Enzyme design. Structure first.
Site: not given
Ligand SMILES: Nc1ncnc2c1ncn2[C@@H]1O[C@H](COP(=O)(O)OP(=O)(O)OP(=O)(O)O)[C@@H](O)[C@H]1O
Ligand SMILES: Nc1ncnc2c1ncn2[C@@H]1O[C@H](COP(=O)(O)OP(=O)(O)O)[C@@H](O)[C@H]1O
Ligand SMILES: Nc1ncnc2c1ncn2[C@@H]1O[C@H](COP(=O)(O)OP(=O)(O)O)[C@@H](O)[C@H]1O
Ligand SMILES: [Mg+2]
Ligand SMILES: [Mg+2]
Lengths: 51, 456, 506, 177, 456, 68
Positions: C371-372
């Protein structure tokens, strides 16, 4: 190999140190018992009331 | 002091002792009059201990006096145990009278410390094509024969015992845990008739025995192997079924007052398994090489018991019911079996490439099988048709006639060396045998016997 | 030669006075749980002292008795034995002195290299830094794998789950991620939960053979050890990792089996008779892993200046976590896997079908996610990973047409071979981590079309020979890219000239 | 469950009634007699028979005790029998004294010395213990030949140990840790 | 009066109070000398109450004094909560000092009565074309939001927060049910940078908090929303994940010892969902509209959690990864997204026919695209090629530049009315814009802006 | 066996008799189920009246308590 031999030497010193202490404490128990009964029984009881 | 039985329920017995004379955990107790031993498992409180009978309870009553022995079960150890059959309590279960022991050890013990573990990669040859190729065993390593019911765990172990124990110069311990009494008799007469009984200690706890017996038989056999390892010797330890140890704990767990966990197992499944498995190891004094047969409930490898067992072993050999149902033995799955020795640094690049080459062809055939079933074989590419033919030859070249299985097949046994195995599979992958029919590779031995079989 | 008499001189300087202690008596002992009568002032989480130097922890403070769990061996304890309050919670040693050492869940040395010289201790159970004290994740953590570092990037302070079945490289991927940190500046922690003692020793022997042990703390709670020690080991290792983060530095922690920690916590709970839920786990099994994993974080400069009381300034500290979980036959819907997949920032899924097909790293890039994302990548890897994503996606769509490559349309046939060559590039060897410059050569060569005349079977020897060529004739360019992973028109032209020259003679 | 858990409601009921009617000593005597009688082997057996009703068992226990139970204590014995709790009378009796002791502001201390019994020693410790606990102290001295020299004071869960054997324990753990 | 702690078992704490001072169910209790709050769950009897700690229980002991507060957990409400981050108890988790509160409300209350309901269905004009055409929201309705990460969920929430405040004089509340601490910090800065923070109240229950906190955060955020509705406003209540509200209820139910239901959920599953969802309605003063993100376990829509939630949803907005690649940043799927308000008996025949016309043309184009791919563009009829051209224009006209997205789009934001939305799509369906290039219909807002963007 | 609903410190049988067969006291409250002591003449399926206008239904008639 160098590190293994150096740590083996300090391990022998600390292992015997533990047994030497245990035997010295065993002697201290006997030594204490003679003087502890007359002198220390009054001093211990009175000191514990102050503590 | 002395205790009184207060509560008997199945194999579990409660004994009440003076509140100043409560026996220790795992301590052995003896019933007065009746010949029965009880091991303390829990201290309920108020001088009462919960124990499990190491025999039958049909003759036990409430109020019978029980005696505290001051220690855990002590079994005989050393040279006197060789060539003898014994029970969980170490009593001789053969008619050869008493055993001349010079020492008794307690079955319960601590696992060797982290500083005592030893690492070795000496390759051990078995003589089986599938194992020598994808599951290379190591001296001092832990092997597991995973499989359901009727796929070959006992047969394969017997073949290994024959191809290793008989040649092994050191001693050996064979433990039959929850085994059929008929297999134990056949193996005893086999070791006796082969003159190898002199170097094998035999401990038996079959399915007709009380839960407590099947729960401690593994600790008795291991205690004898640990005495030999600690003398600086190289030892072989064979366990018939280590699942029976877990099951005996499940059978008794609920009567011991423990709430059940997932799939109706004891909540102590992973610790009870770790406490046994960490003692079966090769330390810096001597080396225990061990082979354990692992039963898989309903053929499901995801069942908590089999699933918790994989992490304790170096070599994992998986037997498949779908291969056995095609009349192919040994029924080893070459895609689920694995070893820590299957590494280019340990076995060499040629062996490693041949094993990975065989696995690649078999995985590709597994995904083409459904295509061939619905559409048919002519709708495949020329590369796929050739690969399917070789996959079917490799799958049959992994079958092998065994010396311990001649009564079941009628065909003579064969021993293939590691050099011969690699050569035979490298040749099939390369294409040196694309003319011979797939039936020529079924139950033969080395690749030359496939060439002779094809002509006939 | 003589030392026993001097160490005894110190023993004659120790307290011999009476002390008020709060005590109790053991009532029952079973399966690792000792029930006590008394201890009216014991706190939830306090450590109880038993005869023989054995210690326990209070977990069930019921009205009429205390249910305590042994942090060691309980088969020597018995009814009527004395139990004493300590007034203390569980604490472990912390500091740089732990680097290159193997310790138990309580911080005691098990490697035999001697006593630890730690100058401080800290609490195993602590709260995570609050929302307002954090900083967004924008610094990379290279694992040395082209498939992970290019498509599933991990940043400093991120929590990335390694998920998949048994025996498919989960441990290898995490150990190689630790080995790659020996020159980076990130301190590393490896926590072994429920493993056999000989397996932990093969990882330490491989950390030593690769030069990574001097930068790593190894925390062990093996399969024969008490379920309480296996339950506490991840928190002890986390506490050792939090030292570096709170003081302005960066650390990496690996929990080798969170599923074994959950199994140990379930054992203690069912034996304390706590109400059961799905798969027999206690009602707070989500809170067990969430309380642990929310500590892995990146903290702002103001938190580090507040904690250090001004000593460290201008520096943001972090703790990155790589928890590992085993699935049964690919079932990601099981209770514990579902909880941890929802707690973490991303997941790396390893697959048995890919591993058996020769794809050694086994990373399923179609379902794995971070998700980063691009914020955890250097400029060069962020520019060359975009096309690698498109080529693998196109290969997943066009994988059935390989048996009909002749009958395909030319455009599609061009895409198909590109997809097959990029897929063969992702294959890598164990204990062979690649640097930012070395990964950049391989990704650049495939993304800029330098593999169209290489047989899909020679892509690997082409990669190995290309890196070896640049290591001899372009050592200055590799060193330049390795400074920050920077990219510009001079580096782009420089790499191109070297690849063209490589093909023209090698 | 713990006998203390099952006996807590009954002991508290006896205490709250006894306190509100100025009978804290009458109930003490009654509960102590009931506990003793119920523990006797002949009475133990009688109380575990399937033929007798709850009222018959209750009545038999009141007849053996007689004058020792006042009207209210007699009603309490019937209530315990009706609920099938006559095996908890010793525990109910124990917990009643504990509630009463906190009420009277007193503690039954259990001093254990190394070979000594003296009024000079007892009154010298009892003032300090009374001051520290903020309660009246009922010392129950005894002999512990095991101790080399000194005394161990037990009061509630508090244990003040000033014995030389305690100093030997401390000295032993210090060397091996 | 005050009571005493009698038992501590994890997050579950039992407290004893005098017979005349027993606290009520859901009453909040305070432990003396420690910052710990207990919510009462059950009255066991004999003066003892069972409560769940709203914090950690580490360091607590039996015998500590506990004080009753006289009411349920009471939180600050009104204008002072805007631009602030708070915990489940209403404490300011941001380091910005105390909240300038004028009033406090208890988190537990009954849903508005049968007589308090509004006299019909009124659409909430979001100002977003694709939502107002295909996914019409009713005032007081519940919207389910589906999709993965990196598809515009956060940007879409910030645009809705901006539009309700600037175009309708309303306010927003965000309930972070099981919020990740990293994402909670990132969202707070993104809203400060996008200038929407002063239009929303933030309530967070982080994943590392006990089950009781994660279960009550939805009621804390809902209590703040109820206050604004009473003021005379239309309010937006955003719930970060409704599945985590269900799971927190399952965890609490297991801790309290209740018997589990189907698939292991709590027996109170439908009642716990109804107590939350029935407060979100259109009253005779104002209207709370809710946007809730939905997670589906094991991809099974028949699982008790998805099943129960879908019973209270009025609309379903699906965000598509494929649409995002095309370049339509809103990323709402016009074929998978649905609304119960898409009925001619509610929105009138004109809006309904225009929306169904757009969906028919977009369906046919998805079928034709497979034909064009497999067989080629030359294989299609003249009528089908004309449809493909209108479908492409419709697909791009579903895009819109948002005021919170000016940093990404490099263009000023647009608020299209429902009237302008219907007129633009009706014209493209009828062919009034067939001469314009499709690009002229990309990121423009209303239909007059497409005309000009084409003129240049 | 464990504690039952009648076994409370305040259910003191000072007078060994009985009175008020139509009235009782709430012993415990949990998830919509109430235990009542003393309703000696309540019928199975009867409506029970509590303060503040609330009603209950009698479902469990035991020796020592009523479940509603
Ligand atoms: N490039 C590779 N990457 C990972 N593993 C590899 C690779 N090449 C070969 N292997 C081998 O695959 C096996 C993976 O074992 P590993 O312990 O890492 O798997 P695991 O899933 O963690 O197993 P376990 O469940 O027992 O812990 C090892 O034998 C390893 O040497
Ligand atoms: N190698 C083999 N060759 C031939 N038959 C075999 C072989 N292995 C197993 N079988 C068949 O199955 C039986 C052996 O099963 P066994 O080894 O007892 O299995 P398990 O121990 O797994 O239950 C034989 O009786 C035979 O019928
Ligand atoms: N309306 C938009 N206009 C332009 N770009 C957008 C828009 N919505 C999303 N994006 C792009 O997608 C990225 C992720 O959007 P975001 O709302 O943060 O999704 P998520 O919260 O799931 O991460 C943004 O950083 C931006 O690059
Ligand atoms: Mg068998
Ligand atoms: Mg592993």
């Amino acid at each position: 190999a160098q590190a293994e031999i150096e740590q083996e030497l300090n391990s022998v010193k600390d292992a015997l140190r533990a047994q030497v202490g245990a035997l010295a404490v065993t002697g201290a128990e006997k030594i204490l018992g003679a003087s502890i009964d007359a002198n220390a029984h009054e001093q211990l009881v009175s000191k514990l009331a102050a503590e | 002091s002395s205790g009184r039985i207060v509560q008997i329920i199945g194999a579990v017995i409660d004994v009440e002792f003076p509140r100043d004379a409560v026996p220790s955990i795992y301590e052995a107790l003896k019933v007065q009059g009746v010949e029965t031993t009880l091991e303390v498992q829990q201290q309920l409180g108020d001088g009462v201990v919960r124990s499990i009978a190491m025999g039958s309870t049909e003759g036990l009553k409430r109020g019978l006096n029980v005696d505290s022995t001051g220690a855990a079960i002590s079994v005989p150890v050393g040279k006197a145990t060789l060539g003898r059959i014994m029970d969980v309590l170490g009593n001789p279960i053969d008619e050869a009278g008493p055993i001349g022991e010079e020492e008794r050890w307690g079955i319960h013990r601590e696992a060797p410390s982290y500083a005592d573990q030893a690492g070795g990669n000496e390759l051990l040859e078995t003589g089986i094509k599938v194992i020598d190729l994808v599951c290379p065993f190591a001296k001092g390593g832990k092997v597991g024969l995973f499989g359901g019911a009727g796929v070959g765990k006992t047969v394969n172990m017997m073949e290994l015992i024959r191809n290793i124990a008989i040649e092994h110069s050191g001693y050996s311990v064979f433990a039959g845990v929850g085994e059929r009494t008929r297999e134990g008799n056949d193996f005893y007469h086999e070791m006796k008739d082969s003159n190898v009984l002199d170097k094998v200690a035999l401990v038996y706890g079959q399915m007709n025995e009380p839960p407590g017996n099947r729960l401690r038989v593994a600790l008795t056999g291991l205690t004898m192997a640990e005495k030999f390892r600690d003398e600086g010797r190289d030892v072989l330890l064979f366990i018939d079924n280590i699942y029976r140890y877990t099951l005996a704990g499940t059978e008794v767990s609920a009567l011991l007052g423990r709430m059940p966990s997932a799939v109706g197992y004891q909540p102590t499944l992973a610790e009870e398994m770790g406490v046994l498995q960490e003692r079966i190891t090769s330390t810096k004094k001597g080396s225990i090489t061990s082979i354990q047969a692992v039963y898989v409930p309903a053929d499901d490898l995801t069942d908590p018991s089999p699933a918790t067992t994989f992490a304790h072993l170096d070599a994992t050999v998986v037997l498949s019911r779908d291969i056995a149902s095609l009349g192919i033995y040994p029924a080893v799955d070459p895609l689920d079996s694995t070893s820590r020795q299957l590494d280019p640094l340990v076995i060499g690049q040629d062996h490693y490439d041949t094993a990975r080459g065989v696995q690649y062809v078999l995985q590709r055939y597994k995904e083409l099988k459904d295509i061939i079933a619905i559409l048919g074989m002519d709708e495949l590419s020329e590369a796929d048709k050739l690969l399917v033919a070789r996959a079917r030859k490799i799958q049959r070249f992994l079958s092998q006639p065994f010396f311990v299985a001649e009564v079941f097949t009628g065909s003579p046994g064969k021993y293939v060396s590691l050099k011969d195995t690699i050569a035979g599979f490298k040749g099939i992958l390369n294409g040196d045998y694309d003319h011979l029919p797939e039936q020529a590779f079924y139950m033969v031995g080395g690749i030359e016997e496939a060439v002779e079989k094809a002509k006939k | 030669s003589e030392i026993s008499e001097i160490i005894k001189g110190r023993i004659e300087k120790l307290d011999v006075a009476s002390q008020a202690r709060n005590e109790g008596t053991i009532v029952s002992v079973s399966d690792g749980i000792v029930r006590i009568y008394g201890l009216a002032d014991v706190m939830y989480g306090e450590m109880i002292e038993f005869p023989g130097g054995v210690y326990g922890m209070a977990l069930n403070l019921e009205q009429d008795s205390v249910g305590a769990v042994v942090l060691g061996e309980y088969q020597g304890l018995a009814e009527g034995m004395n139990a004493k309050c300590t007034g203390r919670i569980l604490e472990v040693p912390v500091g740089p002195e732990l680097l290159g050492r193997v310790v138990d869940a309580l911080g005691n040395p098990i490697d035999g290299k001697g006593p630890i010289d730690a100058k401080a201790t800290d609490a195993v159970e602590k709260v995570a830094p609050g929302v307002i004290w954090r900083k967004s994740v924008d610094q990379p953590v290279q694992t040395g794998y082209k498939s992970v570092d290019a498509m599933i990037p991990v940043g400093r302070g991120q929590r990335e789950l390694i998920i998949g079945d048994r025996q498919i490289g989960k441990t290898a991927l995490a150990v190689d991620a630790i080995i790659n940190q020996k020159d980076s500046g990130i301190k590393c922690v490896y926590v072994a939960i429920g493993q056999k003692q000989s397996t932990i020793a093969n990882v330490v022997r491989k950390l030593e053979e690769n030069g990574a042990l001097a930068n790593t703390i190894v925390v062990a709670a093996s399969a024969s050890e008490s379920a309480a020690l296996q339950y506490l080991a991840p928190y002890s290792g986390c506490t050792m990792g939090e030292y570096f983060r709170d003081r302005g530095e960066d650390a990496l922690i690996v929990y080798d089996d969170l599923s074994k920690q959950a199994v140990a916590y379930r054992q203690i709970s069912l034996l304390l008779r706590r109400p059961p839920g799905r798969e027999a786990y206690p009602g707070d099994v989500f809170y067990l892993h969430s309380r642990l994993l929310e500590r892995a974080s990146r903290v702002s400069e103001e938190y580090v200046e507040k904690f250090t009381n001004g000593a460290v300034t201008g520096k943001t500290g972090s703790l990155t976590a790589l928890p590992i979980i085993e699935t049964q036959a690919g079932d990601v819907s099981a209770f514990v896997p579902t909880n941890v997949i929802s707690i973490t920032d991303g997941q790396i899924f390893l697959e048995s079908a890919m591993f058996n097909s020769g794809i050694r790293p086994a990373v399923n890039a179609g379902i794995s996610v971070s998700r980063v994302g691009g914020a955890a990548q250097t400029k060069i890897i962020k520019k060359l990973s975009g096309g690698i994503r498109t080529a693998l996606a196109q290969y997943r769509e066009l994988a059935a047409f390989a048996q009909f490559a002749s009958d395909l349309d030319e455009a599609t046939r061009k895409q198909l071979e590109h997809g097959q060559r990029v897929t063969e590039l992702m294959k890598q060897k164990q204990y062979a981590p690649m640097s930012i410059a070395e990964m950049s050569l391989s990704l650049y060569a495939a993304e800029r079309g330098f593999l169209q005349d290489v047989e899909i079977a020679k892509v690997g020897s082409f990669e190995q020979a290309l890196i070896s060529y640049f290591q001899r004739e372009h050592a200055a360019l590799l060193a330049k890219i390795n400074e920050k992973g920077d990219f510009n028109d001079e580096i782009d032209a420089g790499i191109k000239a070297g690849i063209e020259k490589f093909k023209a003679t090698q | 469950a713990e006998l203390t858990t099952l006996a807590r409601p009954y002991a508290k009921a006896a205490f709250e009634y006894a306190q509100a009617h100025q009978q804290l000593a009458d109930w003490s005597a009654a509960l102590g007699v009931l506990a003793a009688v119920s523990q006797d082997d002949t009475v133990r057996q009688l109380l575990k028979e399937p033929q007798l009703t709850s009222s018959a068992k209750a009545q038999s226990l009141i007849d053996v005790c007689g004058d020792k139970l006042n009207a209210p204590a007699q009603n309490f014995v019937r209530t315990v029998a009706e609920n099938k709790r006559l095996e908890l009378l010793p525990t109910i009796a124990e917990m009643y004294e504990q509630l009463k002791a906190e009420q009277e502001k007193s503690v039954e201390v259990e001093v254990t010395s190394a070979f000594t019994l003296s009024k000079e020693q007892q009154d010298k410790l009892a003032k300090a213990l009374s001051a520290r606990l903020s309660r009246e102290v009922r010392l129950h001295a005894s002999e512990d030949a095991s101790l080399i020299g000194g005394v161990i004071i037990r009061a509630g869960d508090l244990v003040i140990d000033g014995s030389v054997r305690g100093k030997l324990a401390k000295l032993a753990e210090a060397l091996k840790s």
